[PDB]
């Protein structure tokens, strides 16, 4: 349906495998030349986007306004093939308690996993590292799915960052953090 349509569309249009130090990750291009990639992915000076070795233009580890890890490494590259502005779908108000996870990372490249009920945990520790605005979905997930895009038709919630037990945890990509950047 339209939800899976959006997922498979987003995947092929703005999602591309960014291979870096920790392996292959889901490169979520926000717009033009800026894409987001997990911090734990360890993006360096040069990354392999779809195999294409591209050097970093600006690597900004996005932390939360409460000066805590947000875990979104704003990876700005001098991107020739500009990304479509999917920032309009990035929401501050999710309203999408029904989400789908599009994994395009190390363990699952091109894997649409509907998570079902998605909620938020607020503030918690992520790999013993305090991280802000953590999303919680009751859906058993594991390593390898981190970096995946948590989205629905019309709403991009963020990216899978990890998990705790049977509850998966994603980073809440609030429109506010991206709409302001230029």
């Amino acid at each position: 349906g339209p939800n899976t349509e959006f997922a498979l569309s987003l995947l092929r249009k703005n999602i591309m495998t960014i291979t870096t130090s920790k392996g292959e990750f889901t490169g979520l291009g926000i717009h033009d030349r800026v894409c987001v990639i997990p911090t734990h992915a360890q993006p360096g000076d040069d990354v392999l986007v779809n195999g294409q070795k591209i050097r970093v233009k600006d690597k900004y580890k996005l932390v939360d306004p409460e000066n805590i890890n947000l875990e979104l490494t704003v990876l700005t590259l001098d991107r020739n093939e500009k990304f479509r502005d999917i920032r309009g779908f990035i929401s501050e108000d999710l309203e999408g308690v029904d989400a789908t996870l599009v994994v395009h990372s190390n363990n699952f490249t091109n894997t649409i996993l509907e998570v079902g009920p998605v909620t938020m945990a607020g503030l918690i520790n992520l790999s013993s590292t305090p991280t802000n605005r953590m999303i919680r979905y009751d859906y058993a997930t594991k390593t390898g799915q981190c970096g995946g895009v948590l989205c629905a038709t019309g709403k991009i919630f963020g990216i899978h960052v990890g998990g705790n037990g049977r509850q998966g945890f994603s980073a809440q990509l609030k429109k506010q953090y991206f709409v302001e950047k230029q």
Binding site: P38, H40, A121, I124, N125, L126, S127, S128, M134, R136, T141, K142, T143, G144, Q145, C146, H160, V161, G162, G163, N164, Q167, G168, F169
Partner: peptide, 6 residues
């Protein structure tokens, strides 16, 4: 929670 990176 201490959720881990995945």
């Amino acid at each position: 929670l201490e959720a881990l990176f995945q």
